[model samples]
Target: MKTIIINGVQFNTDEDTTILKFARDNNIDISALCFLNNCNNDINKCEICTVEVEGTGLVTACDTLIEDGMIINTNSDAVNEKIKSRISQLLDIHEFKCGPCNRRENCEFLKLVIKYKARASKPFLPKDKTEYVDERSKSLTVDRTKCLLCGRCVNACGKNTETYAMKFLNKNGKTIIGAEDEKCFDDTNCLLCGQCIIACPVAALSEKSHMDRVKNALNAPEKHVIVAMAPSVRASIGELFNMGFGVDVTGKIYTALRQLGFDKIFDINFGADMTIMEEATELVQRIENNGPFPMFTSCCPGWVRQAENYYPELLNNLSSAKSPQQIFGTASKTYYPSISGLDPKNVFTVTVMPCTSKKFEADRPQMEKDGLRDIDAVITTRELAKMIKDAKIPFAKLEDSEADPAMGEYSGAGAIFGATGGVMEAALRSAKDFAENAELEDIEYKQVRGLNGIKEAEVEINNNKYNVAVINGASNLFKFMKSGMINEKQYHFIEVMACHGGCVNGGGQPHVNPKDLEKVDIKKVRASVLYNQDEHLSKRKSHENTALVKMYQNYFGKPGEGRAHEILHFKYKKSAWSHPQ
Candidate 1:
């Protein structure tokens, strides 16, 4: 047991934790900057959580452990002065243009600056910041002018993805955080998952904006803009509009996109169903073929990049089925246009996603047909929110609206694609039925569902047992591969999502306040919204989606064969990159 008095309130507890965590738990306010995911910035401590102890003086509350009989003052003159000075130093190096800053509203550094009333010693007014920014990557952007050098991104990239892709680099003798050799993130092993951007407290890191592309296409009279949102977006974008977490604003999002001047609104869940139709078919075929044992999910572009960068040998093993985004785009341009009698060339498809890597995936050269790109532009959830705000749309008060039925209709299986293990469960629901040649009563695969880093399950399909594994994050994929777990069993299928807790915790999702992040199980809460949608929908299986079935029956001949394989399936080849021995 331990006893401590914080801010004149006596507290007796058995918790052995940092002062920041303890105070947070006990409802005491303590400001933090670099501390995130139970870790502090080891490279450069922000010291924003400075607290004064009776005899120990001042220390950062985030990392300083609470000892028994300790008297702590979270808000003291000494602590405030120290924290203020640190902020002022940061301000000296920072680009103080909050108006033009991307994170002007939700920036943690900006919040801290206002709370501390800190002013810069000498305001930073640069003539040109061209040297300070790196916009080379297709998925990510870095503006060093706004960086606090807190190391949150560096730590996050290491812990969440285990790639250590975001690194502390020395450029012209000044230390900065970026990809290896400070080259483009696409050229490095970086998955471009956007976890690093999510970890960043300021506008230093962000998704590469495709807003201009979206706006231009929308304005073009010759173009018909079709906007589709991922399952996670409907569950997450509400947070940006003061609607708390786990709120399913699917209808509101549809309305907002319409108000934003989109010609048509579609749901990526439809694409998810399409992915399942094709992926499940591929899995069943692989099982029949009996040779190419395990097939990995190709839905997450981040994971796809991970394969291309580090585990090139796994390229062939990855399912040839395009991700939900690509498949949807392919259908939007080809199938939808074919049905609507609109020129495929004039149909510009845009996708709103919870992943930054989706931008990269949509822009892939192969994700096109007959000179028409599958996706015209890809925007993150944050970007979509910005668009709504920019358009002066009342997102919270907007009446519910439905997406165009031609391509928007999806199943319960498709709705659950936002959560971890969702793809596996969704696929199993269909694969079991496909392999058995009958609709199975048991659709739920509870064994495959959860926030666990790696989850494995054994299933009986057509009286034959098949092993399946779900790699929840990029790091888990590395662990599953490097630990020789792949050799332990002849796995039939594996589902891999680069972001931890699936797309709900994606890099492109709305940024939750650090304090709120501690209070809420953001991943579980956001994922529940998806699960709830799945539970309510009538069509629970991908094959049961009538619209998808109609599309397949009418246009694409069959799943995973001939026309479907030619248009929808994309295979990755091993890249010519030197691997570390």
Candidate 2:
């Protein structure tokens, strides 16, 4: 323990604590450019956090370790001038085109520019154009025009996927992010997670907008636009409207989309329930038939892509169930058209998801049928809000609306799939019912729930205790899977979400600026939305979803039957043809 006085405020800090971390913990305001606490291999590149420490004159607060009896002045005239100088230097080389910028409303660079009143004394030198915007990624975009060169996106790419797809590329003395091998992400074995977009301080990284295509579809008289909202979208979309964190405006969102000229709005929760049924059945089959031990959930496309890129050996280990998004897309083109008397060509299926990888998922060759993709377009939670705003729909005043019947109905289990352990818990509910031969009064698997990096639990059902593990974030999951401890750790079932805190805190949900990272607990707040939804819903288990039961009885025979497999199951590629062709 160390006692130090930071800005005349006496506080005790650990001997190894950084001054920036101490300032963050003690509510002391400190301006910084690139200093992330959770980042790995973070070098003190940004010299903006210069502070006066009595005898040491000035030092980078990010790298400097705290010592006992240290008298620190974070807000001194000399220190403020030093930080302001650095801000000016950063801004001098930067390009500021705020109008077309995606992060104009909530950009970290803009926050500092406004706060420090930073201005470049000299104009930015003429740089090469056209090559600034790279369109290599089908789902994501990289605009280096407004790059801060903060290295957050680089850290995020490595932290989330460990692919290192992005690197500082220096061409003609101008350094930017791109690989030398391919000049862009399309050339690399990138997972397309969009964690870089979430980590970016500016609009340097973002999901390619599909809102215009959606608008065109809405305007076309010949096309019948059909849309489905993913379970996670509802939990985080509220942030775009005035619906604060943890607020459930599912009904409001439904109504607003209707006002935006959506012909029919289906709920992806219906597909979520179907996913649970199929996944649980697959889990049981593997448990009885002797599988590769731990069966991993395949609902997260990011995780699936990672498996295809790096862990090809574990392709067979992943479940064959399509994600709830793709399942709904398949159902929309098949069953929904039959029931609604609509032609498959005329019906344009769309999905609103919290994840950017859903865009990649929808674009996969396997998601197509008869020259038409199962999902015509994929919009993230942020994009949906943009559409709601673009259509001039008064989101805050919109009345509560029910989802369209048939494919819109779902269970509590389906609703909670927005959170990290949600899929596992939902499937476990079905597994418990199957193992016990009856529904239990209590179906909640609280142990697997929360914002923890990894959660493990064991359930004793019918004398067969099932070991389950739920992991969020690629680093945590990857470390465990490759630790050489897999055989020692017996996990009958496993669930993994590529993004930390699950889809509720997905890469495409909302623009959480770097400044707000320390202040807000977005993951915990958004996860609560789904949990609260589950607590309020009538039926808790996926099997309890009447819509799913009707689909099983009327269209499909059962969970693992022929029709179900044709519609809901998607095979993961291994060795030769691992990725989507």
Candidate 3:
């Protein structure tokens, strides 16, 4: 047990933790930047969390351990001066353009500037701003002008994915953060998951802008723009509108999209159902064939890219089912045009996702048919919020509305696809029913649910037990494979999501302030909205989606058969450059 005084208040704690953690736990306010996921910038440290110790003059509260009988002053003049000076120094190299900045509403640097009343010693208004910006990647962007050199992104990339794709590089004898050789991120092994963007304190890192594409498509005279949103978007986007955490704004989003000049409004949960139908059918067929034992879900592009870069041998083991977004896009271009009497070439499909990698997935050369791309554009949750605000739609005040029943309807199983174990559970629900040919009353697979890095469960179907595993995050995928666990078990199925906590905590989701992150379990809260929807929904299995069933019976034949497999499914091949042994 240790006794410590913070801001003149005494507290006794047994937990061995940092001063920042101890102070936060005790309701003591201490500002922090460059500290996230139990890590801080070691090389280029940001002294924003400075505190004055009784014996030591000043130290960073984020890394300093709380000692017994220590007195800490968090808001002393000396501490404030030190923190202010650091901010002032940061401002010297920062671009102070706020009005057009994407993070203007919630910039941590801006908040600190206001708190400390800091100003740059000399404004850094460079004439050639193009040199400071890099937008080469389809999924991510970098703006060095707004960077604070805090190393938060570098730390997050290493911590979350265990892939040091985002690195600190030296250019012209100055330290900067970028991919190796300052090359385009897509040319490297970067997963483009956007975790680095989420970890960033400023607008230094961001999703590559798709607003231009959306705007152009909407304005085109011949184009008919159809909008669809992912399962995680509704549950998470409400955070940007100050609706608080866990608020189900699905109906509001429907209303908002309609008012935003969309020709048709749809839901990606419909695509999730489509994915499950194909994937579950594939799983059952593999069971019949008695081989290809451990099939991984192919819905997460980040995980798919990881396989391509680090473990290409796993490519053949991955399910051939296209992601919900791609499946929906393919249907939008093919089946949608058939039903709506619209020209396939003129139909533009846009998806609102909680992932940045979806942008890359949408742009894949193979994701098109007859020279018409399946998906015309992909926008993140943050981008949609910006669009709504830009259009001046009162999102929170909007009345509830329903999506068009055609391609917008989805099952409860599809609704939970945003969480970490959601894909495994949803797949099991449909796969088991299809294989056993019965509506099993026990549909929930709770064993696979939660934030565990690795989860395994034995499921019984047709009186036979099968093994399944869920790799929760990209980093955990490395742990599971490298720890000799993959070889130890004859797993029948596996689900891997790159972002921690799944799409609910995706890189393109709302960026929570450090303070709010501590107050709310963001992952659980956002995921609960999905689970709650699943509980109340009438149809909980993917195959039960009536519209989907009709489409298969009428246009696309059987689930994993000729036409469906030809049009809806996709396979990945190993890259030329193999992963190192």
What lDDT would each prediction earn against the true structure? 0.91, 0.81, 0.93
Q: Pairs clashing in candidate 3? A: none
Among all candidates shown, the one with the greatest lDDT: 3
Per-structure clash totals for the candidates: 0, 0, 0
lDDT of 3 by residue, 380-421 (tens): 999999999999999999999999988999999999999999
On a 0 to 100 scale, what is the lDDT of residue 364 in model 1? 86
Sliding window of 10 residues with minimal summed lDDT for model 2: 35-44
Report how far off residue 149 is in candidate 1 (Å). 0.5
**How well does candidate 2 score on lDDT at residue 104?**
74
Q: Write the per-residue lDDT of candidate 2 for residues 1-581, one digit (tens) a residue.
A: 88898888898656577888878777787777786646523643777788889888998887788998889998788887777777777777667767766777677888888887878777554477476777767678877777778888888778776778767776788777765454556446776778888888788788888887898999999899988988878777777776666778889989988888899988999989988889888887787787876889999988887787777888888988888988888888888877889988888888898888888888888787667677889988888887787678888787899998799998999998988999988998898787668878888889998878778898886677878889887777777677764566688888988888888877788877555667778888888888988999998998988877887888878886688877678888676654575
TM-score versus the correct structure, for each prediction: 0.98, 0.92, 0.98
User: Considering lDDT, where higher is better, how would the candidates rank from best to worst?
Assistant: 3, 1, 2
Show the lowest summed lDDT stretch of 10 residues, model 3.
572-581
Tell me each candidate's RMSD, in Å, in order.
Answer: 1.6, 2.9, 1.7
Candidate 1 wrongly placed segments (more than 4 Å): 575-581
